[PDB]
């Protein structure tokens, strides 16, 4: 399909290289968005969680796919973005708690989508390797992501390389009789991993 | 050689100057460089990325709702829907895009632009629309029968999902164009389907674009 | 064009801070320290945060003067301490004589001193945003002393200018629309302000 | 010959104006601005209006002195602002520290400062006469400040000299016989004066 | 040549600098060198 | 690497001693002598005693100043006497005018004087340890005089910096763990101190 390769370069260096299907999220008329830190989303699941928590050093690339499941009588549009070094700020104790900074595999719901919860206009969050989802055109999106870092071979339990963000620009709406929540599904597949 | 005489300009410090200074830590060696994937060298190529434009800048609208254009069905066939100017550097709709925030660090610019529209409605919705551009130094059209004469493009969102237009050439400094959206045909809908939709503006620049003078910006934080 | 370049975008000198050593009145000391930074002013913050990773060199210039634009011939000393080293703590402490803290001597009536400093970092680039878990990118300090035995009674005002060379930026990010509140942290206020000016209607113009 | 050239006709230095910054008496301020011009004197006007379109570069020299030909060692600052930019409005305003307004630092007892400025125009040449529908050909300004905290009480007198290089003139026109009245406009008096001296008769001579 | 102008950095003394200084005893000659057996040139090889 | 070298280990400038010539109060004299050394400070002693035989050259710099960081224009004289020669003994003795004691003249308001001295030794290298049977390695002296007829009443403070070039070290030896007590002799105190910090047990750690 219409796969996008971030920055045009692949990472380029059985049991721990397989598809991991995450929890499904429900989309409603009122909704802000969700995000996931990506060096940790899998730090509690499968073999990958075990060898990441044991070994000191880590490096890897990733491939992500987002799927929708709606009908021809629904309407909406989403945006999927990947942000290297996504730091989350706190509005006015100058210290966000652990939950927002390091959410589990289920992610955290956005509080203020307009400023991207970091004072970022969100009208410019397209320089990042993004993609669009329109409920009348298609229902899929794929993204490749190499291993960006300043110092090679960093930690996996004390660092966050990047984050993935999904935001509804246009609001969901429908007519009477239709299901009141389209589901969304996310999958991951580690590629060229090292320890 | 030895017979030298000094000349005016001696012992002055000029901020906009480059020369030679001795190192303070001779023999030190820095960390070797490696290959970080992304790299931007030219500042001008950041204006080619298409960002979203804010045309709903009207009081009593806040949040993320200031980014969409509402289109209805009960509206008549011949009337205006929306309009905005072209000036990137000036205040207004072009303040929420990377072209109109990087043109505040310079004074003179010239070239062509690019605007892309996108429709987000139900699959079984059909209709037509009209988009026009009035050249610089004229009057805004009052009827669609007058906007039909100049430069325009028809759009049927029931058969296409996105359309694009290109401005020929603009050049401002420090009266500059206008674009309008008109209705042509109403909005048709089958039973048990919503009667609302939205549009996105998606402004951007072109390959012929130059900046000619450096100055500090004014929109502080 | 050449003017729309990363090389020319960051290639200028400019003030980064003012330092005054006071030896009169309620305060009678001869030394003053200053932690070198690159993001002490808002405008340079918004221009340096268009990227995430950077690597460059720095050149520093010192202009010093009395309080009435007069330039007598008293001697002065400028010393730079690398990161991970004790800093002076008195007018005539022991650290003022060490062979590894590069120091320079110049008079008050002379062309301004000018020095250069290499790229000091244990990584391959500087980071303004760090998602992992008093400037963050430590570079050093500058201790300024007037060489004298007893007090002098005259205050000195010092400004400093920095030029950066051989810039390299890698990944971009959008600019900032919210007001700055705290240093080293992106915390923002609770009253979100719209990025664009307002208009009476979507079908009106001037 | 070489002496009867356009190149040698305009190639000389000369005064263009005097500026005094006053910090004593009823006026206690530290700054003074001056709009740069090329036609502030009558003689240079009549020599620059032999043509209509011109293109050149400029070099500026600054000589500064007290009121009794004495040269102490107080510091001074010269700043040039390009067209289309705010100008300072106070002794210690914010505009005195900007990285894009090229400024220079020099002392009062030193060889005179000397700087050069390129050809600044949005057209292909300057125009002294414009038939279409506060100098007309805007080029910039010069703000001069004495770096001090409080007042000084001493006035400063400054002169400025300009040299022009690489001249190019295109279309000529006759000279001026009427007296100048207003700047930027060719308005002339109502008492027309004859261009030639008078004579008793057409058949007489000395 | 003759038309020279001085630049910032003049008349300063930098401790971490190397240059040229005139000899104070011209014409003097030192004792010739001979071969003392042991010789360490690199400081890093004392850690082995 | 280049940084882990004998060449870079010893290649730095640094203070070796301070000298003050006093001509006020109970002491009214114009001259002061200083026996040049290389091991006047503890840190340089422990760094120069990693070897036994060495050979190098030396460069000396002089910085001089009043007691209030002021630099008037009085004249001064610096003279170096080679080993095996009488030294001055009065403000205006005969030894101040000899053609074989290299002397230099400089003012108090000028860039610091700088001179170089060759390798002065009757052997093929210097020895810090001599098993056979007032520095040991005699090199010379420095006499400093203010050229004047009568007294002046103003004291002068002088510091001196030394750089060494073309180093050569031959045989190494371990460092020092005991406190220094006397110069030119390795005598140590009677309370032997352990080289390593203490621990509660051989099976405990933090």
Author numbering:
A (entry chain B): 98 to 110, 127 to 205, 214 to 316
B (entry chain C): 1 to 174, 188 to 234
C (entry chain A), D (entry chain A), F (entry chain A): 70 to 202, 219 to 291
E (entry chain C): 1 to 48
Paper text:
CVA6 and EV-A71 are both viruses of the Enterovirus genus. P1 harbors the structural proteins that form the capsids, while P2 and P3 encompass the non-structural proteins responsible for the processing and replication of the viral RNA. An example of such a platform is the baculovirus expression vector system (BEVS), requiring only the expression the P1 polyprotein and 3CD protein to produce enterovirus VLPs. Second, native virions have the viral capsid protein VP0 cleaved into VP2 and VP4, whereas VLPs (generally) have VP0 intact.
Single-particle analysis with 44,582 particles yielded an icosahedral CVA6 VLP capsid structure at 3.15 Å overall resolution. The structure of the CVA6 VLP revealed typical surface features associated with enteroviruses, such as the prominent star-shaped plateau (mesa) at the 5-fold-symmetry axes, a narrow canyon-like depression surrounding the mesa, and an open channel situated at the 2-fold axes. Furthermore, the cryo-EM reconstruction revealed that the independent precursors of the particles (protomers) consisting of the three viral proteins (VP0,VP1, and VP3) were highly similar to the previously reported structure. The structure of our CVA6 VLP matched well with those of the CVA6 procapsid (RMSD between 189 pruned atom pairs: 0.729 Å; across all 207 pairs: 1.181 Å) and the previously reported CVA6 VLP (RMSD between 196 pruned atom pairs: 0.917 Å; across all 221 pairs: 1.354 Å). Despite these minor differences between the previously published CVA6 VLP structure and ours, both structures indicated an absence of the pocket factor. The second indication hereof, also deduced from the cryo-EM structure, was the absence of the characteristic VP0 cleavage into VP2 and VP4. With a sequence coverage of >80%, our MS data unequivocally revealed the presence of this concatenated VP0 protein and indicated extremely low concentrations of VP4 and VP2. Our 3D reconstruction and associated radial intensity averages reveal weak, but unstructured, density signal in the particle interior. While previous enterovirus VLP reconstructions did not detect the presence of RNA (center is masked out in the CVA6 structure), we consider the presence of RNA to be the most plausible explanation for this observed increased density, whereby this RNA could change conformation or orientation within the VLP particle. The observed differences in critical force and critical indentation indicate that CVA6 VLPs can withstand less force and deformation prior to structural failure than their virion counterparts.
